[model samples]
Structures are given as structure tokens and as C-alpha cells.
Target: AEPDLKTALKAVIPAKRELFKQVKERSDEVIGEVKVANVIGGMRGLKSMLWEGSVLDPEEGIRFHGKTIKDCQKELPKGTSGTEMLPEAMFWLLLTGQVPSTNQVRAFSRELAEQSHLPQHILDLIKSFPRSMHPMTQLSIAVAALNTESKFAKAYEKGLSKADYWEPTFDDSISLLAKIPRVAALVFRPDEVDQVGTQALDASQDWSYNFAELLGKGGKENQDFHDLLRLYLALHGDHEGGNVSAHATHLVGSALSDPFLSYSAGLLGLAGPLHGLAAQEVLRWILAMQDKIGTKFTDDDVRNYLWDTLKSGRVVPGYGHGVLRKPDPRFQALMDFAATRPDVLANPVFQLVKKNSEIAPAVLTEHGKTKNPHPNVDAASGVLFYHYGFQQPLYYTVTFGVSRALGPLVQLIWDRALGLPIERPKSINLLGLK
Candidate 1:
């Protein structure tokens, strides 16, 4: 049985308090400051930000208010069939510490839909871009164009108090989140289709339902796809404050830039190959290698291809992680989902990739290099996205950015509401070390 809302609220209150205490305790632990150049360029591991609340370790996977990803998957709100939790409902749970009822999920979905109506000029701007334009470029330009609508920046320039900053930020966040599906669909759908004939936005459906519909997957099979969408969004939402995008958001938000500008800045950081862009790289690399070696390559061929790529001084795009010491639990979660579907499991690439992942660590261990071979979330996400017909690799990071925007924006609002101070980090200069 689900716990009462009061009980859930009580539980989170203490947990939040403890987190606040730790943040205060660790705020002044600086022994010495490192130069900005040294920090960004150096391979040395620096202490990560003290992000209170929850931390999803790739080794252990997601734990929401201490609940495992699998647990959340099983217990979170599902539609009438109980097959999957609505992604928006998971967002509500992550932000509010309670499982929203079906009615509540419905209301939240409507609210999000209502909040997201982009200007007609913006749509025209996207339409004007050449068909050859990369999706990321279009997404970035669209998001950058959103700056004209930033309420927080306007409010701050007018001298609003810290407490009031989040109001406009929240408004802008909702608007951006709501409009992303439309933007994505416009950018990715076939040019031959008449844009005006697309289905109108339906506030009654869940977030994923709206998204799948926008992407032209309105049929019944799209239901499971919706569930997966929710799960993907929930899992990828936040990964501590130190991640490139999260840090970028917090940094810009300190200057009182509204959510649109701050998140745009964050998306810029996420565009890096070593960061969120890795997902796209993984798919591209796989497809490229497959093309070069023909489609029927076996597991042995995959292993050889990986070794050849690594030996050629290129980083294996998706095989390992910087922080995770074991196969990313998020990867495992998606793998479980894939395993349940025979079509997804039967993909020779998926089977070969999984086999290579299992053997990678063992291969590395034999040479005392095991610490670097663990499979990260990027290692698995592309296979699923590819299976779903999302072949435009450049847009993968934007999708990640879209899902992630929901969490951090909600957190930013909470931070303001709870009187969290402006974010700032001290730095020193590096003295030209080569």
C-alpha cells in the first residue's frame, strides 16, 4: 500500500534538514583554491559539489528519497494498465516527495501543456533553417532565441528580491519544457509531411504521450514507449551539481539570468563530446563501424573493432565512465526494459554490444586496467533510441537536455523558496604550466 501523503512529507522534512546541515558543515572546507585553468584542464580529480537531497551513483543506480530505480519503476504511478509510470508523474514525485494520483498527474500534465506555448515567430524561425542544419544547432538557436522571453532577468533588472526570482524562473522553465516536444518534432520529422496536419497539442495526455504523439507515434504501441520515456526522463534528470550542464545552470542562475538563458548556457556545456554529446557519438561510432565492417559482424568482430578504435588513440565513446566503478545501473534498468521486448533483444548490435561490455572489464582486468572499463549510461542509451527510430544522432543531447531541464529547474525554484543563497565558487589563477 502507498504511504499517506503526510507520512511521506514528514519523512522528507528530516532528510532535507540533514542535507542542509551537511551543506553548511562542508561549505568552508577549502584547504587551498586551485586555478580555473588548472581545474578545467587538469586530469586531477577535484572534490565535487555538495549536492544535497539524492545522488544517483552509476554503480548502484537511482535511489529516490532512498528508493531504488527498480522500486520506483514498480511502485510509481502507471496508467490503467500498470505497465509504466508516467514521466511527468515521476517528475512530481522527484520534486514533491509524493506519488501523485492519476488525477494529480492529469492536472500536472495539463498545467505543463498550458505553460508551454511558444511564439509563432519562433516556429517560423525554425522553419526557415535549412534541412541540412544539425538538430543541435537548431535547438541551441531556438533556446537562445527564448532569451527574449526571460521573466527572471527582467524582474532582477527591476530590482526584485531574491525570494521573487524563482517565480519567473519557474514560469520560464515550464514554458520551455512544454514547448520542447513541438520543437523536437518540427526539427526531426520528415520534410515531406505537411506540418499543419500534425495533431494539436493535447493537454489531457501525459507528458510522454504528448511527446510520442508529437513524434508521430500516436498508436497503442506508443504506450510502452511513453512509459520508457518517463523512466528515461526520471533517471537522467539530475546527476549531482558538478555535471557540466547542472553546474552551468547554477553558475548562470547566480547572476540572476532567467531559466531560459541559464539552461541555454547549460546546454552549451552539454554539447561537448566528453559530456552529454557522448550519447550521439556512441550511436554514430557504432553505425560507422558497422558500415565499415559490414552488418553481420560477430561478438569477436565487435571486440576487435573496440580494441582497434582504442589503440588508434580514440577514446571508446561509450564503454566507460569517469565516476562509475561498475556498469551504470541506469544502463542495467534500460537493459531490463529491452530484455522484455523480443524485437529490442533480437537486434544483433544490442546483443553484441552487451557481450562486448561484459567482456571489456574482464579484458581490462587481465591487464590490471579494470578500473576504466565499466559501462556508463551512454553505453546503452543509443541502442534503445536507435530501436525507437530516433536516427538523428545530433539531437540526442538535446533530448537529454530537455529531460534534465525539468529537475534542475524545479530544484532551483525550491532553492529560492527555501532561501538558498546565490551560487558562487572561488577560483585562483594558474601560472602557465605546460
Candidate 2:
């Protein structure tokens, strides 16, 4: 049986307060500033969202439900190296708040696969989109169309009480989560059809397998790649609530919007350039740098170009994070995974990036701008995805959105179920600063 609300609340609150205290102390010592930065400020608001429950800090890399990314990484099952955790397994753990057995993971996979079927109208909706439409745009439209099936919207119209809000929220969350893979599959279907001359969904495969299968690479090797996809999605699922995407979801959810509507609001944020789109920008920047210098540029040349970008007063696209002081653990986790795959590690670009990461920080420190030089996960992720044959940089944000959805979805369910209050904040203006 699940724990009661009070028990669950108690489990998370103390940890949150203690974590926030540590965050405050560390930022003061390191950054030498006391104002609540976005990461810290957002956490404060999220704490309120939890109402009487716990608050999790994304920067601290902890979860309110008592899981760390490290714990999830260590415990989740893997298809290849036991050294890495699979995202599918992590998703199961996040949803249930308990590590799943291998059999349970398989059962969950089967459940997701069965749920993968979408209304034919959704496919027809996709068909109407011009090929010129951004994939995320296609995704947002399809997700919004899902509102047609929203139980909460339907229930509210019939006069459901505040206490009854959770059931429909859960329904919306499950439906949205299940439908995403199908939407992703459909986006990649044309590629598969062109490559293989046939297109059909295989019900026998797992969700990841079916997704990769639809993308024209569903071989044994693709199964291995699917494991990477799962791990990426799981690890990136949530990073506290302040991120544009997660916060947007929370903000909308606080207004009593069901999970589907809230998640779409968040997805719109993800489509922005400064947020989830940063991942795509990083790849594009690197690719453009490579193209400019010629692909044969040495590690030193790459470092020189990075320095040149910084020297011009441009922020290095993927280096430096809003919240992370040290390198992102997720980036380090991917590095660990890449180390195991020789085909990936053998790529000269990967080696060049590693060299650039090592050298660029020193260059920045020498010039007194080192504070903004740390590489976030986005810097490393694209090269790996590129190695696996996903070359279109624009797709990177969608990948991030898929992973991040887990965090907001879980939070949405908890807020509605626990009767958390609506979210509203005091406004600020630039004129006040003067």
C-alpha cells in the first residue's frame, strides 16, 4: 500500500529544507552573491507547491521522493554495460517511487507498448502538417489535440470537487506519456518508409524498440541505441521546477489546468532558444565551428575557436550552466557511457570536445571569465547522438522535452492529488532596478 499523504509529506520536507540551506551556504561561499538566483528562487516556489510536503533541488541533484540521479543511475537496469542505468527502468521507478525488478521493468515496457496506439485522427492531424513544420511544433499540436480526451476538463464541466481533481490528472498524465512515443514514431516513419519501402508498427516490440524500429534502425544495434535513448530520457526527466519547461508546467498546473494542458505550456517553453533549445544550439554551434575551421581542425584549433567566440563576448553555447558549479553529473554520466562504446569514443570529434573542455576552462580562468566556462550536458550529448547517426540538431530539444516530461508529470499528479494551492507570484519590473 502507498504511504498516506502525511507520511509522504514528512519524508520529503525535511530533506528539502536541509538541501535549500546547503544551497544557500554554498552559493554564498562560491559565487559570492546572496540574491536568490533562478535555480534557488524557483526551488522556493516549488517548495510552496509541495504545500506541506518536501521540496527537491535540481541543482543539488536530489528528488523529494528520496531518489538521487546517482541512485537511479546505479539501480536502474541496463541492456549493455551494468555500469550505466536505462531510462525506461528509471521512469518506472519515478512513477512508482520504488525501484522495479527486471520483470517489473519488462511488464512496464509492455504496458507502454500496448498504450502506444493513438487515435487515427492524431496521425491525420500530423499528415496535415507541412514538412516544413518544426518537429516540436508538430509535437505541440498533437499534444494539444490530446485535450480532446482530457478527463479533468470533462469532469470539471460536470462539477467535480477539488478533492476529485487527481484522478483525471492521473489519466491525463498517463495518456500524454503513452502517446508521446507514438508521435515520435510517426515523425520518424517517413524516414523508415523511404529507407525500407514499408511502414507498419510492430506490436511485438517494446516502446523504445518500436520507436527505433519506426525510425529505420530497429536492428540489434538499434536496440542498444534504444537503451541509450531510455537512459537519456530518464536522466534528463526532471531537474527541479525552475527550468523554463518544468516551471511553466507547474505554473499552469497551479491554475487547475490538467496535466496535458500544463505539459503543453511547458513544451512551449522548451521550444524557446534560451532553454531546452540550448541543446540544439550547442550542436549547431559546434557543427558550424567545425565547418568553418574545416573538419580536420586539431584540438588546439577547436580550443582557439572556442576562445575566439568567448573573446568576442559571446557565451559559449553549451558551456556554463545556470545552476551547476561543477560539471553536470548527467554530462559525466554520458561520458562514462561513451567510454564503454569504442565506436563512439573512436570519433575524433569526441576526443576534440574532451580536449576543448579541459583547455577552455583554463583559458577562461586566465582571462578572468572562468565563472561561466563549465560545460553542461548539452555539450557532450550532441556528439554522442551525432555518432549514432542523428545529425539534425533541431531534434535535440525534442529529445530533451521527452526526458523532462517525467519530472513535471510526477509533480502535477502530486499537486492535484494533495490539493496544493494555485500558483501566483508578485510581479517585478526593470524600472525597480534603476
Candidate 3:
């Protein structure tokens, strides 16, 4: 029998612990100098945090555990009929830095299903929210409430030692990851609470199978939809530790907060317009263009419309990135997925999105403002969701919140394993600096 996620992790912990020890021993050594601009400019590239999972390269984009997105797509295990890497395989890679065998992923999928049900009270809590409440808000509240079941919190109260902290943290991380899909499904469609929560999940299926089913897009007709979810989730799993959601989760988890609450904080960050919410913003912007111009317009029309947007003092919503200086590979992956499906290629909204990707970069470059004028992951993703019937832009980040849990939670487990301290930084007043 193959070792499961936890057992596989156990084999790697000793070497990682030793690695942490050696790094700490040279704590006094200067890695890089921080500038006044960095301190004042949102710490854009400070090189301060220690992230064990992925690294975002300016030219290359995100690489998980030194493996490029193409590497993971080709190397990680896939579901029986899946064309994309399974989200569970991405989870294993993020946690253990090792791609799992198909048999191992199958067993891990079963383990996740067994732990996937939500508590009755959490269901009630979600149901009680107003339907107009933002879905991301509902997700944040639901995830925070689940902290009542935190194994790390319970163990700490029971006087658990530092050396053993990672065990309970690991337990809680698995539980949170397992349950988020249900939370997302409920948040997206409260009317189906009874069917969504009470229905038995098929342990025989992979995680994305159950996710697509819960979202009401399951079965043979929507198999492409299932593959889309698998590809989307795996690609969005992590973008290093600097992004808002990952940073918030890591900062809170460093204080020993349980994974549920920690991830809840990250969801709040994800809900902001500049971060995960940009997916919805991109859709809204493009749809507005389609509405005003109609689908029959030419390339010059798009270029003219882009100038109008810029002239009106509005930046094109999804054209630039904070870290990536080139066309985002995640966007390319989604485009590649769509190229395989004629139906996606023909969808009016998707067609407009593809058109925008072709035209927006040149317009942004001419506008003379942004550092990177290329389409990012959000550019392709939201419209694809639109193509697949997730029409409401407001609920987009809830799905982002779900995929986001893998990276930060895995880092949380590692944080406990290495006994990482509470994250605190100093601030200096200008008046006192003289």
C-alpha cells in the first residue's frame, strides 16, 4: 500500500526540520537590504517572508515547489477521464513537494470525501444569512464558525508541546480543505441546502467530481465542466506567500491561530476588489463592452473602446499584474483548455474575452502607465465561469477562496512543524527618525 498524505509527510518532516534549524542558525546573516521605497510602497519585493510552497517569477510566473505549471500539468496525477491535473494531486504537491501516484491520489480523494460533510449548525448559520449578502462574506463567516472544531486549538488548551503542534495542525488543515467545497456550494446556492448538504457524497469519485455535482453542473453532459474545475483549482492553488490571501493566512497562522480561522481571514482579503474579486471585475468590464458595442464590432472598435476607458480615468480591469511582467501562464493554460472545446470558443462572452486579450495589451502599453500590460489569470477565468453558467460575478471569489486554501494551509502545517514564531514587524515614525 502507498503511504497516504500524512504518512508521506512524516517521512519528509525530519529533513525539513533540520533545514529550518540551519536557516535559523544564520538568522543574523543579511539576505537582502530593504529600502525606504520598499517600506513605504507595500513591500512589493522585500524578499522577507519564508514560503515553502511556490515562488512567483516576474518572467516565468508561479512555480509550485520548483515545478512549473506545465510540469505539474504533465507530471501530477489525473482522474480517470480527466484531461487536467486533479486538485488533490496539486494539494499533495503543495504539502509534500512530491507529486502523488494515481493510486495515492485515489485513496486521498476517498479520505477527503469521508471528512467532507459540514456540521448541521454551520449549515443553519449559512442558511440564516440574507440572500443579498455577498457570497464571499457568507464564506468568511462560515469558515470562521468552523473554527469551533479546530484540533490545534483543542490540543493547545490541553497543553500540547511545540514539537507535536504540527500533528493537530495537520488534522485541522485536512478537515478545513475537505469541507470548503461544501461551504462554497452552499454559499453559491442556498436554495439547494437540503440537497447539497444532506446528500451523500460519492467517495468513489474525485474531489472535483463532487464539487461540480454540488454546484449543479455534474454528470456526463458537464464532464468538460468538471475538467474545467479541476484545471482551475489546480492552477489557482498557490501564488507564493506575498499575495493578500496567502499573506493573511500565514500571518495569522504564525500566531498559532487554527487553520479554519486563519483561512477565514484570508477569505476577507480575497474578497477585496484588487485581489480575487478582480475575476468578477474583469467579467463585468468585458460584458459592459459587449453590451455597448455588441459582438459584431471590429478590432479597431475594441482599441477605440479601450482608449475611451482610459480617457475616462478607468484602468482596464484585468490587464496588469503586480508581480508578473509577461502574459500569465495560468491565462495561457485556460486559453489552451478552451481551444480544445469549440463550444467555449463560440460563446459570445468568451469570444469577447479572447478578443480583449489580443487587443488590451497594446492599448495599455500606449496609455503609458502600467508596468505590465498583459492579461492575467483573472482575464480568462471569470469569463470561462460565465461560459459554464456561473453567471453571477459576485460569487466568483468564493471559488477562489476554496482553491486558495491548499497553499496557506500546507504552509500552516509546516509553520507548526518548524515552530515558526508569531509574525511581527516594526514601524518607525518620521518625526522620530531625525
Model number with the top lDDT: 3
**Residue pairs with clashing backbones, model 2:** 12-54, 13-54, 87-230, 87-231, 320-374
lDDT of 2 by residue, 38-124 (tens): 344544433333321123444643453576567667777664333446555665555445566666555555556566566667666
Query: lDDT by residue for model 1 over 54-121, one digit each (tens)?
Result: 57665565566566677777777765443666667666676666667776667767777675566777
Model 3 TM-score, 2 decimals: 0.97
Report the lDDT of model 3 for residue 251. Answer: 95
Error of 3 at 321 (Å): 2.4
My TM-score estimates for the predictions, one after another, are 0.83, 0.81, 0.97
Give residue 397's error in model 3 in angstroms. 0.6
Where is the poorest 10-residue window by lDDT in model 1? 1-10
Off by over 4 Å in 1: 1-44, 48-50, 80-82, 157-159, 190-199, 288-301, 420-424, 432-434
Each candidate's lDDT (Cα)? 0.68, 0.67, 0.89
Per-residue lDDT, model 1, residue 234, is: 69
The model with the greatest TM-score is 3
